[PDB]
């Protein structure tokens, strides 16, 4: 809808493909930028449309936010593993890698494991068991 | 780093399409959202039951003139 013409018929992007070097950085990644929306200066913008970029914007969400909550869930399930062993003061410096990998492959299916603790009420700690200040 | 290493076309440029919608919801016809005082066939443009937007034709001459600071190009 906007003035973000695709880079196929943008009259300022074809000069970036006209005089350019070759090696690996300005030939194959430049013809892959051709299906991207670009303004009046030939630079590929990132707009948010309804359906033409519905999943084109949702791949950087769903790919990142899975392995954002994969680092976070394997770090949460490791700190909870070493506190039931009653040795958490010394297991945080010397990382017990047979358990941290065991708590990593338990976090590979973390979206269907967080909601098993939300409906069971075990994700959050209740407010009368958390240290606070004089308030 | 992308402009420094030659490839200025590899910049991540997010077009601010939510505040380009605000100007297009007030009268800026430059982008082309074509809604709600950018669409003259709308309920907000005409104000169909009364048609008492006497401020509106003077306002749209101001927002769509490119010589003032009223709702600059974003």
């Amino acid at each position: 809808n906007t003035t973000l013409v695709p880079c196929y018929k943008s009259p300022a992007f074809v000069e970036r493909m006209k005089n350019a070097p070759d090696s690996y950085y300005t030939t194959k990644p430049l013809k892959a930028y051709s299906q991207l929306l670009c303004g009046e200066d030939g630079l590929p913008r990132i707009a948010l449309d309804r359906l033409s970029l519905a999943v084109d914007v949702a791949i950087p969400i769903a790919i990142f936010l899975y392995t954002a909550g994969f680092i976070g869930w394997s770090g949460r399930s490791y700190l909870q593993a070493i506190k039931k062993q009653d040795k958490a003061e010394e297991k945080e410096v010397f990382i017990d890698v047979p358990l941290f990998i065991s708590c990593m492959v338990m976090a590979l299916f973390w979206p269907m494991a967080v909601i098993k603790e939300l409906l069971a009420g075990e994700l959050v700690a209740k407010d009368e068991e958390i240290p606070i200040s004089v308030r | 780093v992308e402009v420094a290493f030659g490839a200025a076309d590899k910049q991540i440029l997010i077009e601010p399409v939510f505040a380009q919608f605000i100007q297009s919801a007030n009268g800026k016809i430059l982008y082309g959202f074509h809604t709600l005082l950018s669409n003259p066939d709308s309920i907000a443009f005409t104000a169909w039951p009364n048609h008492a937007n006497v401020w509106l034709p003077g306002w749209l001459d101001a927002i769509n003139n490119g010589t003032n600071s009223l709702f600059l190009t974003i």
Partner: peptide
């Protein structure tokens, strides 16, 4: 408890967010 007043003000602001997002994707006019 079932939140009855916290909801229907949060999903009332989410409703106003969805009328503005209806004009944004040019769904309604």
């Amino acid at each position: 408890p079932p939140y009855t007043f916290r909801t229907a003000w949060a999903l009332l602001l989410l409703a106003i967010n969805f009328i503005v997002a209806a004009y944004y994707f040019h769904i309604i006019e």
